[PDB]
Symmetry: C3
């Protein structure tokens, strides 16, 4: 509460000039910018800077009045409990004009808002100009949803008779119908990981170099996870001498298909499919697909990748190829071409009947069969 009333009319002309100048300034309260010192040069009429230099003159404005003036002075306008003040020179990307609404102690940003979600524990999302509640499934991710594998042998190459529900299996190696050799490709056993293995102080079968390389790729270095685990076999596919179904990768190197699924009926759910497997190149070179065609999306250890990328040699890689096809079936779904004579190591393949995001899996997904008990 301050006041300027009751001026002795002898000094009335000065107050008249005051009423002229302040009223003239009141067209638009705009500040060209905050200044901790009075601009000593380059100022004229219409220039308003917030003089916030240390002292009792904080926030006092510093309009310079020279044009059409007798003597120019830094007129001071002490703000008491300031409020919204517009700013022109700088603005937000969305076109909002910067406005520091002084809350009486600090320069605060302008605020608005019309809708606030009711505090009833339900999440709301905008819909056609109105906020609509969301279900519980929105919060949950996809790496945890327990979907089921379409393989009967889990990729363990032990046959469907083996129980997928058992950590330990005694059945010997057995080829999997889900991986059929192409262009004369030969599939042979590569290795096996045994429960209670002797490599880590046990008495069971030892682990070969490929198994340690995979486990290091898995991050399974701790005893609780490296010294134990679920059993499964590994296989190495040698590309045959046949030269059918040519294709070139991103590097322009031609390669031929080496394996096929035997025309599995996996293209049903909206034509969508998903294949997840772990592989490592022991010799030669290989790539993915032929080139960007139809709808495709490749993830490499959680990183998006493009078709034709040549996978680095002698490293374990996680690939997630998900695409759409209304044809209802396909025999060459992987679209993976490898150079003749290339030794490719793979383990724990995982296929799904649609788009799923299970993350970087560690073991094949389970299912139920007659031998599952």
């Amino acid at each position: 509460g301050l006041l300027i009333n009751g001026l002795p009319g002898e000094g009335h002309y000065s107050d008249l000039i005051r009423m002229w100048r302040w009223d003239d300034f009141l067209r638009q309260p705009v500040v060209k910018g905050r200044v901790a010192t009075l601009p000593t040069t380059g100022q004229a009429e219409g220039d308003t800077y917030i003089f916030t230099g240390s002292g009792s003159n904080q926030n006092r404005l510093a309009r310079w009045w020279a044009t059409g003036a007798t003597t120019a002075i830094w007129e001071y306008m002490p703000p008491r409990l300031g409020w919204r003040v517009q700013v022109a020179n700088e603005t937000t990307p969305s076109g909002q004009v910067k406005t520091y609404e002084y809350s009486g102690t600090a320069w605060v940003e302008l605020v608005g808002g019309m809708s606030d979600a009711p505090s009833d524990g339900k999440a709301y999302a905008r819909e056609s100009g109105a906020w609509t509640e969301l279900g519980s499934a929105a919060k949950s991710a996809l790496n945890v949803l327990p979907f089921m594998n379409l393989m009967p042998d889990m990729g363990r190459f032990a046959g469907t008779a083996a129980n997928p529900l058992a950590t330990m299996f005694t059945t010997s190696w057995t080829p999997s119908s889900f991986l059929n050799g192409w262009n004369g490709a030969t599939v042979a056993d590569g290795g096996k990981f045994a429960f209670d293995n002797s490599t880590n102080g046990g008495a069971g079968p030892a682990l070969n170099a490929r198994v340690q390389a995979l486990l290091a790729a898995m991050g399974r270095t701790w005893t609780s996870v490296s010294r134990y685990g679920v059993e499964f076999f590994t296989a190495v596919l040698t590309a045959g001498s046949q030269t059918t179904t040519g294709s070139a990768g991103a590097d322009g190197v031609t390669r031929y298909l080496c394996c096929s699924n035997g025309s599995k009926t996996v293209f049903n759910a909206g034509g969508w499919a998903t294949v997840v497997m772990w592989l490592r190149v022991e010799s030669g070179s290989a790539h993915i697909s032929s080139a960007p065609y139809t709808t495709h999306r490749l993830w490499i250890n959680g990183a998006v990748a493009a078709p034709g990328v040549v996978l680095p040699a002698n490293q374990w890689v996680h690939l997630r190829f998900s695409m759409q096809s209304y044809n209802g079936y396909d025999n060459a779904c992987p679209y993976i071409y490898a150079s003749a004579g290339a030794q490719i190591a793979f383990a724990c393949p995982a296929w799904f009947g649609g788009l799923v995001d299970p993350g970087i899996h560690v073991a094949p997904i389970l299912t139920i069969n007659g031998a599952s008990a």
Copy 2:
């Protein structure tokens, strides 16, 4: 920058009346509207229109000052770097008053907002006045999720021994337990679609009229999707002469149940159930359910439908009936009543134990069994 200072005191009366009028107007800077021309009639004191006509007087105010005045003139207010100006006559539905914030070059709408999602690749939703992070499953749809059919033979009417994982099957027609004749209804084979069929230039079995009608309905007219596909059988159910379990549709025509599921244990997940199946009426008439009971929702080719709708005759319709029931079982779950003697053609049924939205399917959803290898 401009000023009105330091006038010769002789003429101070004019500019004092000036500042008086401007101060009087400054109670609320409101414009009744924007005008490209000065209103020549029907204006008085308190009327303010933004004179934005072509010329240098753009955005100049056009307040008419006649009441209690010697001579009325269109006092002009050239705006320099305009700002928030309120508008009264028209307002938004949510009670927000229109305000054209002039950004110095155009009339910009007033803006607010207090919360912005952090830029860290995460999607947030309002929750109890705070923005809460959403999961990955929220973005994903429901038509691609690879759920499981509860049918062992996929509706192919070839028996459970037939491998669901094979595109082609050699087994002959076989009745499906999931469909059971009611009121003396008889179920007979109607047709079959064969891989490498001769109708499209092949050497396999030909396709009868029903198959072409279905394929045209499915939209699978291209060679890649019409000349190839997964095999399955079609069956036609003839309503029996029995008149038990009467019901009336939306058109008021009484009908009787013709088929039953044999009391399947599908009402488990919260009592929810879902039935998806393709059908076509060859004779007679039929409708869905009896009358609105409990919770229900019918989708016809993706279009919501109400109980009792009489399906058009001789057309393929995609039905998705979903409801809830805590009883734990039901034998007449479809609640489909057809007139006596009506010939109904159906193919590729699919059932689920809960609410799912796979869209308009083109083939029965897969499962796993002993013969799946």
Copy 3:
């Protein structure tokens, strides 16, 4: 529309007094608060209250002008179509300063907003400063999704040969491999619920006290849900005399493990697991887990619970223990320790391969096997 122009040059000293008052007062149009009566005491210069008392004097300001003044009067400021007026003393939690924008008939709140979801049927959420559309799965809940159980016998203790798809079964009681006795614990048949039971006016086997207790806990008291249902057995486990694998609950009472899963391979989906089962304590005491370890979350009938909570004796409780473990397997997954000699009743166990939220289930979740047909 109003003006203060017309007046003689005689009595305009009051007019300029008012020009010195209004202009200086309009530094910031702030009101200390709304008042229905003029403050008769404790007011001075700088105090502004909205005099909103009943009558034609509504909304008029009541600034008291006494300091440096001759005689103080309640200057009145009739608002015509008022607008945004800031308020200082009270503010919103988010730092927003209260502002009652008068819409000409009522005191409305200030409004903002820079984004509105397009009206095209898609739900949008904020993402890195932009609104991104959401999928259909976001709206759906999780209690309804039809996920598949991993138990081959449904927990009915009837053997895998029994068809889970049939409401009724004729096979006798059979132990379940999923529940293996530990510390010498003995598992014995406890009861069975029969379709068309005679307890509710039928002719089938009667129901024992445990079954009525479970049904009352389940809420299935109506005839449609109490007199009818799916068949299943119940078993009672008696803690053995062995004292291996000691553990203490939240109350500090030591207990020992009484059952094990036989090292089932369920920790596959990101190491996540979910166990749901109904139990009732007939004698002794029991608790959950040993102490908070790693990640954990327990729901008791939909209510979150902490490790070690001693379940009330002789009551049915719905438990849902979900935890992550990357080891890939575990034999003592339940982590349930019961006092020696405690008689624990349990029925309809349900396990899943990952985090799922089926709510309070009423029957075991179904699966598919060779005998499912």
